[PDB]
Design a binder for this molecule. Structure first.
Ligand SMILES: O=C(O)CCn1nnc(-c2cc(Cl)cc(Cl)c2)n1
Length: 134
C-alpha cells in the first residue's frame, strides 16, 4: 500500500545521455539504435493492489509490463529481446534486472526532485534518461 506513490503518473522523456553506447553494449543493431534513439517516449506508471504497470508509448515501439515486486516475469523488450525480469524496491529505487542469453542488464528508476531518473547499466556502460511529468 502506497509503495510506489511518487512514481505513479505520466512522464515524458526530456534528456538522454549515452543511450547509444548502452544499446551497443547490450547488442542492439545499427538500425534499431538509430530509430530507437530518436524516440521521446511517455512512460505511464500505475499501481492497482500489488500489481505495478509500466507502459512506454513512443513512435518507435509501445511496450507494457505488469508485475509484482520480487516475482520474476517474461518481458519482450523494445529491441525484441526475450528476457526474464525481476523488479524490486531497494531503498525507494525500483531496480529492474533483465536476464537473457547468459547476459544481464539493470535499469534503476528513482524520483529526484520533480523528475524521474532512469539509469540503464550494461557492464561498464551507463545511460541516464530523465523524465518530467507530462
Ligand atoms: O525507459 C527508458 O527510458 C530506459 C529504459 N529502457 N526502456 N527501453 C529501453 C531499451 C530500448 C531499446 Cl530499443 C534497446 C535497449 Cl537495449 C533498451 N531501455
Amino acid at each position: 500500500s502506497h509503495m510506489c506513490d511518487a512514481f505513479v503518473g505520466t512522464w515524458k522523456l526530456v534528456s538522454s545521455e549515452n543511450f547509444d553506447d548502452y544499446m551497443k553494449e547490450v547488442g542492439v543493431g545499427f538500425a534499431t539504435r538509430k530509430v530507437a534513439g530518436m524516440a521521446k517516449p511517455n512512460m505511464i506508471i500505475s499501481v492497482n493492489g500489488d500489481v505495478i504497470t509500466i507502459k512506454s508509448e513512443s513512435t518507435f515501439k509501445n511496450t507494457e509490463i505488469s508485475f509484482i515486486l520480487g516475482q520474476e516475469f517474461d518481458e519482450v523488450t523494445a529491441d525484441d529481446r526475450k528476457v526474464k525480469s525481476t523488479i524490486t524496491l531497494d531503498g525507494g529505487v525500483l531496480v529492474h534486472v533483465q536476464k537473457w542469453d547468459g547476459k544481464s542488464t539493470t535499469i534503476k528508476r528513482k524520483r529526484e526532485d520533480d523528475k524521474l531518473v532512469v539509469e540503464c547499466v550494461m557492464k561498464g556502460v551507463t545511460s541516464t534518461r530523465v523524465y518530467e511529468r507530462a
